[PDB]
Structure formats: C-alpha cells, structure tokens
DNA sequence: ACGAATTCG
DNA sequence: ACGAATTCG
C-alpha cells in the first residue's frame, strides 16, 4: 500500500503565459500520474481548466474567489470521505488550512495543504499559522495517517522559533537524509519567472507527516516542473515536489 | 546665572535638529539657539548637524565650543559651555557597517570638579535597519562600560530605538540606567518624535516614539533631577525647530 | 515572492 | 523619518 503525490505552488497570480503554463503543469502531472495533487495559488479560471483537464480527479478547493489551494484525488485510487477548512483568522492574504479525509483501500488518511503567509515581513503570522497546522495534525485518530504538503514560506529559523517539529511529526526531506538535489523549491538563479536579477533560494515547499511507527515510510522525493516551456519560462516560479511513500502495517 | 548652590548639577540638552531639512533652516537654528540661551545648559548634544548649521551656532550660540563627529555630510556635535567646561579630549569610534555615516562621538571634560565622558550618536534610522541599530547600541554600551571607574559617563542622543530592540539587546547593563526610566517614566516627556503634534515632515498619520534617550553609568553618584521636552513652539514660519523634540535634563553628582 | 529603494497617505 | 504599498535591481 503506497501513496504518491505532487505538491506545487503553480503561480496562478502570474497572468503572463498563464494558459501555456497551466497546460505545462498538467503535462507534468500526466507524466507522473500521482494519486494526489496539492496545489497553491489556483485562481477561478485555472480551477475551471483543472475541472476539465483533471476530470479523472475529485477536486476540492480552499475558496471560490481570489486565489486559493486545491487538493486533487485520483478517482478509483482515492476514496473521498470529507473536506474541512480551518481559517487563519489573522491572515491578510486569504490563507487557510484545507484538509480532506480519504482512504486508499484499508488505510485512512488526513491530507492537508496550505499556502502560509508570504514574505519575510509576515514572519510572525506565518509562525502562528504553522502552529495551527501542527495542532491540527495532532487531532486525527492515531490509526489515521496525516500528511501535510504545501507552500510554507518557511525559513529554518522560524521552525525553531515555533518550538521545532513535535516528536511525532517528520519532514519528508529530512527523513530521506536531506538530499541536495531536491532541497530548494524556489530558486531565482535557476528559475527566471519572477525576473529577479539576483540569486536567492529557499525550501519553501515542505511535507510533514504523522504516522504510527513505520506505518508511513517516504521512498522518494524529486523536483518537478524543471523544464522551460515554448514561451521560454517555467510552469511556475516554484518547483513542484513529487513524493512516493509506502504504508507499512 | 549658575551660582554656588547649583555647582553639583550638570544640565544638558540633547536634540536631533534636522539639518537635513534645508527649508527654513536659518530660522529654525535661531529657534534652537533661543532655547539654549533660555536654559543655558552646560552641554548640548546635537544630531543631524551640517556645516552651515555650525556657522549658525557660532553666531547665535557663541558661548559654546563645538566638537563635531565629521566634517561633511551630516553629523553629531557636542557643545561645551565656555568658562564652565574644560575640554580634555575628543574620541570618535566608527560604526564599520553603517550605511548612513553614523558613529560614536565622545568628549572627555571636567565640569564642576568632576571628570565626565560625554557621548552622543545618531543610531541607524528606520525600522528596516533594526539589526544594525542594535549592533551600534552594543558598541555604545560597551564603550560606556570601558570608561575609567572614576569618570562619570553620560550618553545622550537619537537612538531610533523601539522598546523591543533594547530587550533583544538583553536590556541595559547592570550599572547603566536610562534617565527617563529612572525618573519613573513620566508621561510629559515620553515621546520625543510625534507626527500628530509635529508636522515638519508632513507625515499624514499619527505615530510617536521615544527615539531620543539618555543613558548614564553610575553607585548613587549620579542622580537625575529632572527631564523636560523643549522645542514645542512653532516659529514665525509656522514650523518647529525640528521634527524631534529636544530633551532638557539636569543631574546631580553626589558624594 | 528576494532585498533594497522609493512612493504614498 | 511612520507603515503600507509599490517599484527597482
Ligand atoms: Mg507566489
Ligand atoms: Mg527510494
Ligand atoms: Mg531625521
């Protein structure tokens, strides 16, 4: 019993080349055919595109206006049981926490995504949001496997300020030994989309999990969306993360 | 006049006089000088002095010896009342990472039968430069601690501090006190920069800060007596001498 | 969605 | 020399 997924901030707020870039995202999704896709910065017409292009997935969204997150669940692999949205009462960017309860065969999951408050300036609110996420991860029954995957905008120091990850919550990248090839998910040296004429890189996109001992084992982690499209730009200013995991009973 | 009874007292003004605003500057300098004439402080600590402003001080505050923190741009100064203060030396300590030509100016003097190290600075400005401002504060506090134990150390200047930043510094050292805090945090002189009450910068909003502060090293030998704002009167041009209020402080040196 | 600089109210 | 918003590099 395995589960595979992609998490990706697809920069729907960039209107430039957006249709081509959306098609680019989905060409990448088609190659890997993940069980679950967690998306951030979806906008309404992008969601409308996904409802047709990804009609083979159940699509759950974090809002209906502005920009928002989504979780796509592969029909026939993933059974959708419920969705839950938890607000971030002090967000200035309409951010929230989107959760879905699902099963794959006999295994129950709570899958969660968010786009935490952006920029250095909003560190304090981002930390409060992270605490909300970690709190929610603890609520599921012990028998349920909890996975958060999303755009956290985190700096390592902010996780320390937060108290560090709890003893029963793990970061998939850390678990896999901090591989260098997929460390940075936002990198202005390698990615030209924002036209930032400087080199900055961050591990903004992260995966946290809580599972009974050895019931969830990350197997691989890889960057996706690394190829330029016809327009000479990438699907997004972020790279996506493709993760495969086994559920070991 | 300063007679026998007041011989144990040092009085001073600290004031960022906004020499970077050239508009109405000569009239505003005359306003500052009128205040100095009224209170006749022993020492004046100034920030944002520019070279033309030194000429205005030589004309309208001629009884003060002027010691400056630099020769060009904008800089601090310490003014010493002739006949009261004996000038012994001046020291300038750089702030190697300043982006605003800031530094620490110290003047060693004798006054009223006591040796003093008088210090001023204009610490790095704006919220954005908090980290550098904190580094500079540490330099200042370190220098206050280094002075010979017999000397009385007083810093007065424009610190640009927010209260949270002093905490991040770990707070003032054990033998260093803030004069305003010492006097019980009086409300009348709490804010030294206030855009509701002062319109020189034409900021269309109401913000207020205790940017200008006085620190002293002491045990029981230096006792603040009073702290008051100055420069709260509009001049003929309808503007204040500066965007900051000045602070007038008197301290007693005790056996 | 970087840090630095600048504009706006 | 404010904070927020925007622009610049
Ligand atoms: Mg973005
Ligand atoms: Mg593997
Ligand atoms: Mg100023």
């Amino acid at each position: 019993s395995t589960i595979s997924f992609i998490t990706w901030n697809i920069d729907g707020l960039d209107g430039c080349n957006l249709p081509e870039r959306a098609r680019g995202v989905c060409s990448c999704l088609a190659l890997y055919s993940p069980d679950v896709v967690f998306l951030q910065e979806v906008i309404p017409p992008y969601c409308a595109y996904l409802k047709k292009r990804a009609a083979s997935y159940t699509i759950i969204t974090g809002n209906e206006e502005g920009y928002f997150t989504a979780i796509l669940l592969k029909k026939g692999r993933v059974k959708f049981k419920s969705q839950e949205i938890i607000p971030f009462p002090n967000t200035k960017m309409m951010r929230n926490l989107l959760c879905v309860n699902v099963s794959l065969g006999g295994n129950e999951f709570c899958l969660m995504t968010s786009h935490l408050e952006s920029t250095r300036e909003h560190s304090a609110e981002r930390i409060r949001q992270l605490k909300t996420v970690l709190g929610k991860m603890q609520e599921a029954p012990d028998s349920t496997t909890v996975i958060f995957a999303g755009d956290t905008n985190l700096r390592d120091q902010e996780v320390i300020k937060c108290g560090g990850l709890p003893d029963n919550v793990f970061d998939a990248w850390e678990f896999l030994g901090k591989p260098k090839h997929c460390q940075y998910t936002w990198d202005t040296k390698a990615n030209n989309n924002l036209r930032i004429p400087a080199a900055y890189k961050h591990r903004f996109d992260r995966i946290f999990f809580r599972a009974e001992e050895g019931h969830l084992i990350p197997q691989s982690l890889d960057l996706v969306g690394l190829e330029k499209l016809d327009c000479g730009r990438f699907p997004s200013d972020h790279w996506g993360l493709l993760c495969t995991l086994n559920v070991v009973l």
Side-chain angles (χ1 to χ4, degrees), chain A residues 32-76:
Chain A
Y32 300 112
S33 308
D35 295 317
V36 179
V37 186
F38 306 90
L39 298 177
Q40 307 83 39
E41 294 193 32
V42 183
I43 61 168
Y46 203 118
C47 185
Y49 169 66
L50 291 171
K51 288 174 172 159
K52 291 170 176 173
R53 184 70 173 101
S56 48
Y57 288 74
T58 299
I59 300 170
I60 306 307
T61 56
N63 214 318
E64 51 172 84
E65 294 273 80
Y67 65 101
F68 46 82
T69 58
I71 299 177
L72 288 63
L73 309 168
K74 182 191 278 180
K75 295 172 180 181

Side-chain angles (χ1 to χ4, degrees), chain A residues 3-50:
Chain A
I3 186 168
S4 65
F5 69 79
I6 288 175
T7 183
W8 204 350
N9 175 322
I10 51 60
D11 198 4
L13 290 176
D14 176 16
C16 294
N17 311 107
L18 186 57
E20 176 172 331
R21 286 167 41 238
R23 295 188 298 261
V25 165
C26 286
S27 294
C28 294
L29 299 182
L31 177 59
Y32 300 112
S33 308
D35 295 317
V36 179
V37 186
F38 306 90
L39 298 177
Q40 307 83 39
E41 294 193 32
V42 183
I43 61 168
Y46 203 118
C47 185
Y49 169 66
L50 291 171

Side-chain angles (χ1 to χ4, degrees), chain A residues 32-189:
Chain A
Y32 300 112
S33 308
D35 295 317
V36 179
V37 186
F38 306 90
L39 298 177
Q40 307 83 39
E41 294 193 32
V42 183
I43 61 168
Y46 203 118
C47 185
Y49 169 66
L50 291 171
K51 288 174 172 159
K52 291 170 176 173
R53 184 70 173 101
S56 48
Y57 288 74
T58 299
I59 300 170
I60 306 307
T61 56
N63 214 318
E64 51 172 84
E65 294 273 80
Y67 65 101
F68 46 82
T69 58
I71 299 177
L72 288 63
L73 309 168
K74 182 191 278 180
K75 295 172 180 181
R77 276 283 284 171
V78 185
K79 177 181 186 60
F80 173 61
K81 301 176 100 140
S82 73
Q83 64 170 81
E84 183 170 23
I85 297 172
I86 290 163
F88 293 156
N90 301 129
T91 181
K92 295 175 173 177
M93 307 182 186
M94 299 308 293
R95 310 305 173 74
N96 58 20
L97 176 58
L98 173 63
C99 313
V100 295
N101 282 351
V102 307
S103 53
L104 292 83
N107 300 313
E108 297 287 312
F109 292 81
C110 180
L111 304 178
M112 304 168 45
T113 194
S114 186
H115 179 192
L116 305 189
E117 211 83 349
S118 307
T119 81
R120 189 183 201 150
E121 168 185 6
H122 292 104
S123 178
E125 170 62 11
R126 170 167 56 254
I127 287 164
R128 294 192 297 260
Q129 293 176 1
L130 176 60
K131 292 183 178 167
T132 298
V133 172
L134 294 169
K136 176 62 176 175
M137 290 186 73
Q138 300 295 340
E139 294 179 19
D142 296 342
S143 54
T144 297
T145 298
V146 184
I147 300 170
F148 172 91
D151 179 8
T152 70
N153 275 296
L154 287 163
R155 288 74 172 159
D156 288 358
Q157 196 54 45
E158 292 170 340
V159 178
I160 293 169
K161 275 180 67 80
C162 210
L165 291 180
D167 284 348
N168 63 344
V169 174
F170 302 87
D171 177 307
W173 178 75
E174 295 182 347
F175 182 96
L176 287 166
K178 298 186 182 178
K180 287 178 174 55
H181 74 263
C182 62
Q183 178 169 2
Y184 300 107
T185 65
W186 188 88
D187 178 350
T188 65
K189 180 179 184 189

